[PDB]
Amino acid sequence: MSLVYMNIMMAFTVSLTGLLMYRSHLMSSLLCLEGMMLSLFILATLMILNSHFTLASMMPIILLVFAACEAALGLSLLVMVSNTYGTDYVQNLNLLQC
Amino acid sequence: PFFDVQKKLGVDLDHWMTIQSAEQPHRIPARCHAFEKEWIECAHGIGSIRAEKECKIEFEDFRECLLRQKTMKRLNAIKRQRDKLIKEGKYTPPPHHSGQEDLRP
Amino acid sequence: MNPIILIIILMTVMLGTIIVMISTHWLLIWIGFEMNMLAIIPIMMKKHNPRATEASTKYFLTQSTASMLLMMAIIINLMFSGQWTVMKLFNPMASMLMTMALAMKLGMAPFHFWVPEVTQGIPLSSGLILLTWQKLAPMSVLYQILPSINLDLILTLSILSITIGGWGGLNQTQLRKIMAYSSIAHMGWMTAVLLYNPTMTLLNLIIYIIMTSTMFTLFMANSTTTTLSLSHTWNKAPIMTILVLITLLSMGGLPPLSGFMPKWMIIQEMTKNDSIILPTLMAITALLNLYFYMRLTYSTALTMFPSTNNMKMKWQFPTTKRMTLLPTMTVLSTMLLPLTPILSILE
Amino acid sequence: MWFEVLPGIAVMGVCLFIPGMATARIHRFSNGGREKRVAHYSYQWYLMERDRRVSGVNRYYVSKGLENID
Amino acid sequence: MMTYIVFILSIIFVMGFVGFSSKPSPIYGGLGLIVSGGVGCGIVLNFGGSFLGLMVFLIYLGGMMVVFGYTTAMATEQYNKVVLGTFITGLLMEFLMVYYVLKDKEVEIVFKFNGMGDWVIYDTGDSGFFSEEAMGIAALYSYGTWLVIVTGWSLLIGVVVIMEITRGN
Amino acid sequence: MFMINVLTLIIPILLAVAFLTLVERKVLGYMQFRKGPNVVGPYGLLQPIADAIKLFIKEPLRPATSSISMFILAPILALTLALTMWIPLPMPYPLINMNLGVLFMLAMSSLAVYSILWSGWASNSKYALIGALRAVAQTISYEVTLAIILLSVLLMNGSFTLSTLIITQEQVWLIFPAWPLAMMWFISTLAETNRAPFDLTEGESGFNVEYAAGPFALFFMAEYANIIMMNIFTTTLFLGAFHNPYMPELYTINFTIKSLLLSITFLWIRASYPRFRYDQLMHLLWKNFLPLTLALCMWHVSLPILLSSIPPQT
Amino acid sequence: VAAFLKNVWAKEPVLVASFAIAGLAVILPTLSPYTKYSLMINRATPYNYPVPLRDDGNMPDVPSHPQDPQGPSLEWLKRL
Amino acid sequence: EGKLVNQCALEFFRQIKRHCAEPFTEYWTCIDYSGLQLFRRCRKEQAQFDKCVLDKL
Amino acid sequence: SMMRWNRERRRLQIEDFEARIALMPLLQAEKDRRVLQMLRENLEEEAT
Amino acid sequence: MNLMITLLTNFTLATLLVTIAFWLPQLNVYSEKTSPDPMGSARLPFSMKFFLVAITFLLFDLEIALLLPLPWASQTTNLNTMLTMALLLIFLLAVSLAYEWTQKGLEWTE
Numbered sequence A: 001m002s003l004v005y006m007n008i009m010m011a012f013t014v015s016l017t018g019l020l021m022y023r024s025h026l027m028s029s030l031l032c033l034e035g036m037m038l039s040l041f042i043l044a045t046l047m048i049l050n051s052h053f054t055l056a057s058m059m060p061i062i063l064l065v066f067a068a069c070e071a072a073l074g075l076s077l078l079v080m081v082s083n084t085y086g087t088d089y090v091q092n093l094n095l096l097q098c
Numbered sequence B: 001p002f003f004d005v006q007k008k009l010g011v012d013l014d015h016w017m018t019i020q021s022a023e024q025p026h027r028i029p030a031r032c033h034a035f036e037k038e039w040i041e042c043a044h045g046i047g048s049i050r051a052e053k054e055c056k057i058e059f060e061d062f063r064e065c066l067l068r069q070k071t072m073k074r075l076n077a078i079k080r081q082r083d084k085l086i087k088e089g090k091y092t093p094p095p096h097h098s099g100q101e102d103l104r105p
Numbered sequence C: 001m002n003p004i005i006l007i008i009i010l011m012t013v014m015l016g017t018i019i020v021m022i023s024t025h026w027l028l029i030w031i032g033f034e035m036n037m038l039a040i041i042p043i044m045m046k047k048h049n050p051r052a053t054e055a056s057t058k059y060f061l062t063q064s065t066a067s068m069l070l071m072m073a074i075i076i077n078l079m080f081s082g083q084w085t086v087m088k089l090f091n092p093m094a095s096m097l098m099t100m101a102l103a104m105k106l107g108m109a110p111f112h113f114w115v116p117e118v119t120q121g122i123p124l125s126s127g128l129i130l131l132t133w134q135k136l137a138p139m140s141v142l143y144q145i146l147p148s149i150n151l152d153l154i155l156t157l158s159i160l161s162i163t164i165g166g167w168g169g170l171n172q173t174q175l176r177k178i179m180a181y182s183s184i185a186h187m188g189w190m191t192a193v194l195l196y197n198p199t200m201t202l203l204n205l206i207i208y209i210i211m212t213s214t215m216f217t218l219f220m221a222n223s224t225t226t227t228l229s230l231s232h233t234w235n236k237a238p239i240m241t242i243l244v245l246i247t248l249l250s251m252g253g254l255p256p257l258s259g260f261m262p263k264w265m266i267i268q269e270m271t272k273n274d275s276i277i278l279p280t281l282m283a284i285t286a287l288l289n290l291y292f293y294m295r296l297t298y299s300t301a302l303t304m305f306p307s308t309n310n311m312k313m314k315w316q317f318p319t320t321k322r323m324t325l326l327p328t329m330t331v332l333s334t335m336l337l338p339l340t341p342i343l344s345i346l347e
Numbered sequence D: 001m002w003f004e005v006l007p008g009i010a011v012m013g014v015c016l017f018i019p020g021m022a023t024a025r026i027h028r029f030s031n032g033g034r035e036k037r038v039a040h041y042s043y044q045w046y047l048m049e050r051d052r053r054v055s056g057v058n059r060y061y062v063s064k065g066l067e068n069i070d
Numbered sequence E: 001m002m003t004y005i006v007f008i009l010s011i012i013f014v015m016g017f018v019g020f021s022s023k024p025s026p027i028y029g030g031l032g033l034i035v036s037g038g039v040g041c042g043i044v045l046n047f048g049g050s051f052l053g054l055m056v057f058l059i060y061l062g063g064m065m066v067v068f069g070y071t072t073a074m075a076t077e078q079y080n081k082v083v084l085g086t087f088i089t090g091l092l093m094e095f096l097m098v099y100y101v102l103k104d105k106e107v108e109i110v111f112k113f114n115g116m117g118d119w120v121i122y123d124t125g126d127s128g129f130f131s132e133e134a135m136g137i138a139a140l141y142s143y144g145t146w147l148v149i150v151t152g153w154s155l156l157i158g159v160v161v162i163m164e165i166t167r168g169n
Numbered sequence F: 001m002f003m004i005n006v007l008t009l010i011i012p013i014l015l016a017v018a019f020l021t022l023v024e025r026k027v028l029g030y031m032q033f034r035k036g037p038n039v040v041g042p043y044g045l046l047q048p049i050a051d052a053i054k055l056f057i058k059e060p061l062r063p064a065t066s067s068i069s070m071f072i073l074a075p076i077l078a079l080t081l082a083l084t085m086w087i088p089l090p091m092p093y094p095l096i097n098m099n100l101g102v103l104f105m106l107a108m109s110s111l112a113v114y115s116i117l118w119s120g121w122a123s124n125s126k127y128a129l130i131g132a133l134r135a136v137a138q139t140i141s142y143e144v145t146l147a148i149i150l151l152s153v154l155l156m157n158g159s160f161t162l163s164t165l166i167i168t169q170e171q172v173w174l175i176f177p178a179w180p181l182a183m184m185w186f187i188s189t190l191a192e193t194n195r196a197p198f199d200l201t202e203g204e205s206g207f208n209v210e211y212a213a214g215p216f217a218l219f220f221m222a223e224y225a226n227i228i229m230m231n232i233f234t235t236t237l238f239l240g241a242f243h244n245p246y247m248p249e250l251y252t253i254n255f256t257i258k259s260l261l262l263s264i265t266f267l268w269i270r271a272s273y274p275r276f277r278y279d280q281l282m283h284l285l286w287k288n289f290l291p292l293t294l295a296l297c298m299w300h301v302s303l304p305i306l307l308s309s310i311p312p313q314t
Numbered sequence G: 001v002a003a004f005l006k007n008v009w010a011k012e013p014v015l016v017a018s019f020a021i022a023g024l025a026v027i028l029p030t031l032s033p034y035t036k037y038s039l040m041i042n043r044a045t046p047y048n049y050p051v052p053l054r055d056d057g058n059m060p061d062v063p064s065h066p067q068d069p070q071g072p073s074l075e076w077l078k079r080l
Numbered sequence H: 001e002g003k004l005v006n007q008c009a010l011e012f013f014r015q016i017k018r019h020c021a022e023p024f025t026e027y028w029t030c031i032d033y034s035g036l037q038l039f040r041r042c043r044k045e046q047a048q049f050d051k052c053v054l055d056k057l
Numbered sequence I: 001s002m003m004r005w006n007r008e009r010r011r012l013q014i015e016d017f018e019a020r021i022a023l024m025p026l027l028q029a030e031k032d033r034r035v036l037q038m039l040r041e042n043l044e045e046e047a048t
Numbered sequence J: 001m002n003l004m005i006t007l008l009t010n011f012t013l014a015t016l017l018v019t020i021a022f023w024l025p026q027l028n029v030y031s032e033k034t035s036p037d038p039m040g041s042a043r044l045p046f047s048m049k050f051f052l053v054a055i056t057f058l059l060f061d062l063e064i065a066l067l068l069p070l071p072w073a074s075q076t077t078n079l080n081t082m083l084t085m086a087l088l089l090i091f092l093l094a095v096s097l098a099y100e101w102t103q104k105g106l107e108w109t110e
């Protein structure tokens, strides 16, 4: 298939493996999650514009909006973590081992 | 559990965006409208198990419309053979493929 | 929380799951999962302590990752099929990604690592919602895509879930982690019979929801979250020890109880398809689940652990908690096996 | 008095007058003494590329009228 | 070379993701995701998605990454080898992808990909006096009733959810 | 030939921003019963030149930056966005005639808060970071009413095309059907550019105080380019002039006079009012402008339908 | 119903104007005689090509030419 | 049939060129000046062309 | 004023769209001959 | 294409002016300065209210993104449904603003 889809899928996998390998910050995790969403937006958009499927042109906007609301919720969770420990470090979130 | 509320109540919540061949605004067709209409009219009602083996031709034509893999493979082959023959000097492109022909209309 | 806001948020959780159940477009499937997650996050942060925020953060990260993999599976389906019907998928890569995403949502092993944490971090009512209501929407999507699910993947996820949920509960004393590893083992049992007979998948889901709702309702009515506080129940309410006895003996699947009903039916559908090793090893692995159920029954019903003196004060006060449907759920989770051919209503 | 501010306003107004006057004269210079063809929609671009093909000089704005037919 | 331009943007797009997926700091990672959003917007714009590309600017970049950078600047108090090694690893894997799919005009990582410029897959007609993508987004109010209801309800509930969980009571 | 057109756009932008500083000092002079600059040039016409040469040979302030890269990027982004807001402006013909020029300007103005945010974080001062967060929150707050007012006006236009907005106003100014939208729009553009009475970066530290005289002058000229641009955009949007297509300079003279009067109205508003407190302009947005803006957005949706006055798409 | 209204118009005229304009936007298109013409003008706008019909022989309402009498007319739009 | 279109258009324009070439030329020149090719800018040249065609054809 | 002028603008839009409609058969015939010209040239050069 | 040329020209002129403003007074040899804020060294205290106004911006910006195709959506032939859903979206933005009001979310930055 087309050549641009290779790069958009590879971008989704790069943002996947960034989201699946945390370093320290939860904000960097949320950025990798939104990179995954952005690559999904681009890939859906290039397909729907290519196929001239008219009714799905409203589809990526929807894919934006919900997920950005999702991002808002994630930011709020991070802030609550930051209001407990002072930092958004993922190693502070280890109390549920016992 | 596929509680088919939409067919039960007769409402149309999301069937309209489901396929490319549905009713579109301003009657805009998809690029693979005809192939998808033929694949759907083939595979309608007979179930998925029969639809995989009995409607393989329409589905392969529709997938090759969607992604154009055989078409781009053929264009790869023709362009590669043309570039090889240009490198060998055994071929020359015509004036209408070099941009010297004063286009049609 | 404002009770009106609690009602609207629980109706939004239910609305998300119902939108997953009734929709014919993959975008509305993804929207129902997003609405479900977005609305269930305040149910987990109901008490506002750092364990609830940690649990909600872990729950958000796992469900968000599964939602992104779900949308990538949907988008690859749109690549290779040019449409959006919630039916079989038209690519084994999209089928693998959707099976992984739904295994992450269900918390099936090896994507199980959030389930005993999050259930520990949240109250008993929100843990009840997470272990009963949050299974319904991904099992509906797995119900509708089973002509595309890889057999080796779904059975690998099933046996890995059953074994890890068996060994995980043996080391626990916290009741919520026991119910979470019980959840992982029972989801393994549900997905092991999915490609053979999904009516038995629905049967196992319904009997599991009844038994889990009974055990969480007993834990809420006795206000016990640990084994050793559940062992004070005989000196406070002796009927509740009988109820946790019969319900834990049901959840292990001992006949003549109704929790013997699903797994037996699952074996009844896996030997028709010439699989003998797999349901036998599954049934032998479920003895671990029954072992830590027996540990809880020895702590609670069949012995009497020592109590404290202040228990004598609680003797003067009856339970004012609304023990909603607890006799109904207790009867249904124990005495339903003579009505086993009722399962045809799920066909 | 107050008209002392008018030289700076005049300078600034000439500086705001320059871009539109410049783009109007450049559009009339680059497009045969006429406006630039506005092609917001693909039909307008189709007509414009047809004009470029029927002009014969690879310029869309060179218009051919009734003298180009017999 | 200019026939490959969207492909070229996509390469930069992948490079931008190796910017923030390697996670240098959430603020440089925010900057890398902003640059990635701009070039992915350019990819969208070069197929004819004008409105969707301006949604990438106005709503993803100007709407959401503003809030990411805003929240991030209220943490990570102002003033690696794993980041640099991860960045050069992702860059070398991407340039090996480029080298293979340009030397062969075909590659297969998971799916088979043609190596021609992505101009070849387009349509050779006109859409008349409308953008088809604009009319498909305009159909959200005429054909997308259930989609509008569930999206607006999810946004209202999202307002309620953020106000419940950020209160601590 | 197109590069000449780009230069004749963007060099007169810099000259008009240069002499807007003189016009501001003079007009604020006479409104304060004094004179403005009249010594340095004849009538003070050499004051911006002298001030530019002074600022570009002043000592670099040399800060310790938390990030060198974003400290460089924030003036670059500010000037690039302040120059790209001009290219779809139909005066009478835009440099870049695009179909979605209104949404393009709304997007490129939504990107302008990153210069404030990056310059605030790139400084080591925490109080400068607090001021940057307040300025960003102010700007993104008033962008909401920008977008909704702008949508409610373009419901009478038919498209996002800026050149169509001249055709829309051939019979009447669009300030007549939309003067409440015009007045909330005008105060929202006053609050976008951090302009008085909304200038809390000078109310008692600015986000860009760690920059040297050169780069702070670049921020300053990007701000005044935004001011002139938003006044031109408000002129195009509500006070659209007569356009003879055979004589485009009539439209150029007319929108130039109206945009000058609107920029002087910015100058005359800063000579008249005290500042808001920060919560008070938050109260102005969220509790006053936004309910009226939503109500008028409902009104301007339903009004072309109930009067059969839906504008054409093309 | 009248003292409360003068009270809220004395205290909060921004919100009274907001709810009043919103109420007019809700109720007034159902009371307008010109809402019908918005629909009629949007369906009179020919974005697509008028794909002609094969003359079977019995279609008395379909014209053979644009300047024929039968067919949909736009006298109401030119007159109003 | 397409050739018939391309045969019937030319007979359309020749019959303009035989009779009313100059009002048509002035009219499409005035149409041609506009970058959107407005009909509303050119109503008097349109009126002259319509008058000349209605009288002579 | 916006009522009268937008109704005039809708009538002018219909006049432009009917000019387009009257021109679409000629453009469709030319487009068909255009694309068949290009496909025949591609076929002949593929043959050689 | 002309847009990309114009963006490159604007970005290049901005980068040139920033380079001149950062390197023209570096040529002078003025003096070395030793040079040894309202908060001294206290860590930046987090404001919940700035985060809430930014999230309220984000959610209303998503609702605006839904509202943006209305000048195109008015051209439809299903105008009763279009008008109903347009009024419903603006009404749900108003209900979001009202709930943000009544639970004191718009307070001390009102």
Ligand SMILES: CCCCCCCCCCCCCCCCCC(=O)OC[C@H](COP(=O)([O-])OCC[N+](C)(C)C)OC(=O)CCCCCCCCCCCCCCCCC
Pocket: F180, F182, F183, F184, F186, F187, F197, F234, F238, F269, F273, F284, F287, F288, F289, F292, G011, G012, G014, G016, G017, G020, G021
């Ligand atoms: C574009 C060209 C220029 C446009 C015009 C602008 C020129 C004038 C500018 C003057 C300088 C302003 C400097 C900044 C001022 C900031 C302060 C300020 O004004 O705040 C806004 C003030 C705020 O008021 P406030 O805050 O003082 O009021 C107190 C409010 N409470 C009680 C909550 C504390 O007013 C508004 O918000 C109104 C905005 C415009 C409203 C327009 C309404 C039009 C009429 C609608 C219909 C009414 C009748 C009812 C329905 C009938 C139906 C038939």
Ligand SMILES: CCCCCCCCCCCCCCCCCC(=O)OC[C@H](COP(=O)(O)OCCN)OC(=O)CCCCCCCCCCCCCCCCC
Pocket: B001, C010, C123, C125, C126, C128, C129, C132, C133, C136, C202, C206, C209, C210, C213, C217, C220, C322, C323, C324, C325, C329
């Ligand atoms: C194919 C199948 C399709 C779908 C079919 C239907 C599936 C139904 C799945 C049921 C899932 C139930 C989820 C949990 C209940 C949801 C509401 C809730 O949160 O209730 C708990 C509530 C909280 O009150 P609170 O005060 O917070 O309690 C803590 C102490 N202060 O109140 C309490 O704590 C009160 C204590 C008792 C609560 C008992 C609730 C039991 C609900 C489940 C009943 C059994 C399932 C229904 C029958 C079988 C259906 C398959």
Ligand SMILES: CCCCCCCCCCCCCCCCCC(=O)OC[C@H](COP(=O)(O)OCCN)OC(=O)CCCCCCCCCCCCCCCCC
Pocket: D011, D014, D015, F015, F041, F042, F045, F046
């Ligand atoms: C779109 C339009 C934009 C227009 C922008 C500009 C607006 C303002 C225009 C200029 C206004 C008048 C300028 C007068 C400058 C001062 C001239 C003067 O008198 O300088 C005297 C000084 C010393 O003279 P000296 O001989 O020593 O005196 C003793 C005599 N017995 O001698 C000197 O200082 C030496 C000579 C210096 C001359 C400088 C002249 C001014 C430079 C202006 C630059 C811009 C010009 C216009 C650009 C756009 C049009 C091309």
Ligand SMILES: CCCCCCCCCCCCCCCCCC(=O)OC[C@H](COP(=O)(O)OCCN)OC(=O)CCCCCCCCCCCCCCCCC
Pocket: F018, F039, F040, F046, F048, F049, F050, F052, F053
């Ligand atoms: C090869 C030989 C040249 C070498 C390189 C030099 C390049 C040209 C530089 C400008 C001309 C050189 C002379 C500069 C001024 C010297 C004379 C002077 O200072 O005259 C004073 C006179 C006003 O007298 P004053 O002392 O102010 O008295 C107060 C009133 N009672 O002052 C005046 O009347 C006004 C003086 C104005 C100075 C010139 C105008 C400004 C500079 C314009 C060009 C550079 C900037 C271009 C634009 C930058 C961006 C805005």
Ligand SMILES: CCCCCCCCCCCCCCCCCC(=O)OC[C@H](COP(=O)(O)OCCN)OC(=O)CCCCCCCCCCCCCCCCC
Pocket: D039, D040, D041, E034, E035, E037, E038, E039, E041, E042, E043, E045, E046, E050, E053, E054, F073, F076, F077, F080, F081, F084, F097, F098, F099, F100, F101, F104, J001, J003, J004, J007, J011
């Ligand atoms: C920190 C990094 C540096 C920061 C400073 C510099 C970047 C920020 C300032 C510049 C922002 C660049 C914006 C580029 C796209 C703008 C949107 C756009 O193209 O809209 C115009 C137009 C849409 O209208 P329409 O008329 O429908 O389309 C033509 C159809 N006849 O569409 C067109 O005309 C399409 C023209 C062809 C496609 C253009 C693609 C541009 C290149 C890719 C994006 C470049 C910016 C990347 C970085 C963003 C910011 C980080």
Ligand SMILES: CCCCCCCCCCCCCCCCCC(=O)OC[C@H](COP(=O)(O)OCCN)OC(=O)CCCCCCCCCCCCCCCCC
Pocket: F290, F291, F292, F294, F295, G008, G012, G015, G016, G017, G018, G019, G020, G021, G022, G023, G024, G026, J091, J094, J095, J097, J098, J101
């Ligand atoms: C039905 C049409 C659609 C309606 C929905 C769409 C409306 C568009 C505008 C959006 C407004 C969004 C925000 C609304 C919030 C309302 C609640 C509120 O503000 O309550 C508090 C307020 C007192 O203010 P306070 O809390 O003290 O704040 C400090 C300022 N003094 O309390 C008050 O000021 C009391 C406010 C309620 C009374 C307003 C009465 C207006 C009546 C106008 C005539 C009738 C119009 C028809 C609609 C019915 C209205 C009831």
Ligand SMILES: CCCCCCCCCCC1=C(C)C(=O)C(OC)=C(OC)C1=O
Pocket: F014, F017, F018, F019, F021, F022, F048, F049, F051, F052, F055, F216, F217, F220, F221, J017
């Ligand atoms: C490319 C550079 C062009 C010239 C520089 C901008 C025009 C001159 C503005 C001078 C100026 C004035 C009058 C000024 O008053 C001021 O202080 C508020 C500034 O900011 C530091 C200024 O920059």
